[PDB]
Structures are given as structure tokens and as C-alpha cells.
């Protein structure tokens, strides 16, 4: 009846080991797909491309989003889902009204591979594909959707220039061609200043940089980064590339949208890379287990 326990520990160890190896490969391939998304997006800014060419790129991006879903729905060949957390009974990523939703859970199983010896199972898919910070990872900013001018959001960050950031959201709004106001989340007046094309705008511990010609009333929001799933980000690029771009206004809006999506993809690339690297020591410990060494624990290590 000790055979029963050894078998159970053995099978547990083999299962987690297989899953962890499949996770590592899946994160590598997600890396590659993200790198391909990044290249397609850079190319889509190219001013020589036609609307039709932009559409073909959008079509490739759609295919990449679809293959990222299949990857997110990888199985471990006992037929259990890799990225569902502990609810590894049904497909964790589902298409629903154009969004990809996560049906798995938030728990990374602690697999007991020997008495009081635990190995961390695969990450919940929420931690890989869904909970990806936006912007630069702590602040996010966008050109407002209703903007009528040609103001391009070039970059942004926390910045010690204007002092210290309180985590709050702000709005940079043009009141003349060469004048703007910054307002806080209650619409109170924080600062005003003179607009210079490509010069930093510093208020309340954050900075953004704008080029082109914002129209009167055009605004730019900035605030703490939230999270956005990888599928939505690819999706937004696809919808941006399908946009009409006949006027300077429409071109700026698409560029602003592409460029924001690209910042988010960079965050998505980093997550995959950072996630993969966070798992390597657990795989190395298992692989090198014999090099690193009579109880249940030692009898198990002597077989594997």
C-alpha cells in the first residue's frame, strides 16, 4: 500500500513536469507570435501603404490573434488544459461577441511530488494572456477619440519635473491652437501652458509629448495603467487598420490608435518573456534533481 503512495507521488511529479515543459514551449511560441505582431504593426505605419495593404496586414494580425487563442487553449495530452488554473476541465479561452473571455480560474496548483515537497504547476491563463498592464506599465495615455485635429501622442511617463504623481488621472485639453489646460479627475484646473510642437508637457508628476496641430477642444487623457487582454490589443490594431484615412484628421487618429496598441503589445511581449523566465528555476530544479541530492522522498528521487 506504500506502492500506492509512491505511484501517486510519481504520477503527480510526471504530470507537473510534462505541463511545465509544455508551458515553457507555449510561452516561447507566444513570444514569437508577439514579435510577429510587433513587426506587422511597425510596417503598418509605413506612409507608402495603400488602404488595401493596410487591410491585408489587418488580416494577418487577425490570423495571429486566432492562433494565440489556440495556444492559450493548449492541452497537456492527458487532455487537460494547460492555462486554465485548477479548472482544467473545459477550454479556458472562449470567443464571445468579438472578445476573448477567460473561463479558467486564478489558482496555480501546488503539486505535492513527495511528502512536504511541492512543485508549482502552470500559471493561470489570466496571468499570461489577460492581466497585461497598458502604456509603459505604470502610466497610460491616449488621444481622445473625438479629437478633430492632428495631434499625435508621441510619448509619456511619470516625471519628477512637475513634482510627484498622486496616481490620479489627468486631461490635457487645448483651449487655443497654442494653449492647453490640464485638469484633474474632478475637472479642476491644475495648470495651463503654451503648446510647442514636440515639446514636453509637464503637470502633476506626469509628462506627455504631442506633435502636429490639435484643434480647439481636443484632449489627451493620462492616468494609471490598467490591464488589457492580448486578444483585445491585437483586435484594436485590426480595427484601426480598417479605418478610413482620407483626411489628415483620420490619419492622425489611426496613428494614435496604432501607436497606443503598439505600446500595449510591447507590454504583452515583456509579460511572455518575464513569465517564461520566472518559471525556469522550477524546471531546472526538476531536471537537475538527481545531481542535487532512505525515506519516501529519497526513494522517489532514486527512480527518477
Numbering used by the authors: 56 to 348, 353 to 363
From the article:
To initiate filament growth, three junction proteins, namely, FlgK (hook-associated protein 1), FlgL (hook-associated protein 3), and the cap protein FliD (hook-associated protein 2), are sequentially placed at the distal end of the hook. The FlgL and FlgK junction proteins that are located between the FlgE hook and the flagellin filament are indispensable for the formation of the flagellum because both FlgL-deficient bacteria and FlgK-deficient bacteria lack functional flagella and are immotile. To investigate the role of FlgL in hook-filament assembly, we have determined the crystal structures of FlgL from gram-positive Bacillus cereus (bcFlgL) and gram-negative Xanthomonas campestris (xcFlgL). The bcFlgL and xcFlgL structures revealed that the D1 domain of FlgL forms a four-segment structure, irrespective of the bacterial species.
Crystal structures for the truncated bcFlgL and xcFlgL proteins (residues 45–251 and residues 48–364, respectively), which lack ~45 N-terminal residues and ~35 C-terminal residues, were solved by multiwavelength anomalous diffraction (MAD) phasing and single-wavelength anomalous diffraction (SAD) phasing, respectively. The bcFlgL structure was refined to 2.2 Å resolution. xcFlgL was crystallized in two different crystal forms, and we obtained two xcFlgL structures (xcFlgLC2 structure in space group C2 at 1.9 Å resolution; xcFlgLH3 structure in space group H3 at 2.2 Å resolution; xcFlgL structure refers to xcFlgLC2 unless specified). The truncated bcFlgL and xcFlgL proteins adopt one-domain (D1) and two-domain (D1-D2) structures, respectively. xcFlgL contains an additional domain, D2, compared to bcFlgL. The D2 domain of xcFlgL forms a β-sandwich structure, which consists of a β5-β12-β7-β8-β9 sheet and a β6-β11-β10 sheet. Notably, the D1-D2 interdomain orientation and interface are essentially identical in the two crystal structures of xcFlgL (xcFlgLC2 and xcFlgLH3) despite different crystal contacts, suggesting that the D1-D2 orientation would not change in different environments and would be recapitulated both in solution and in the flagellum. Our comparative analysis of the two xcFlgL structures (xcFlgLC2 and xcFlgLH3) indicates that the N-terminal and C-terminal regions of the FlgL D1 domain adopt diverse conformations, as observed for flagellin. In the xcFlgLC2 structure, the α4b helix runs downwards as one α-helix. However, in the xcFlgLH3 structure, the α4b helix is split into two discontinuous α-helices (α4b and α4c) due to a sharp directional change in the helix. Moreover, the N-terminal regions of the α1 helices are tilted in different directions in the two xcFlgL structures.
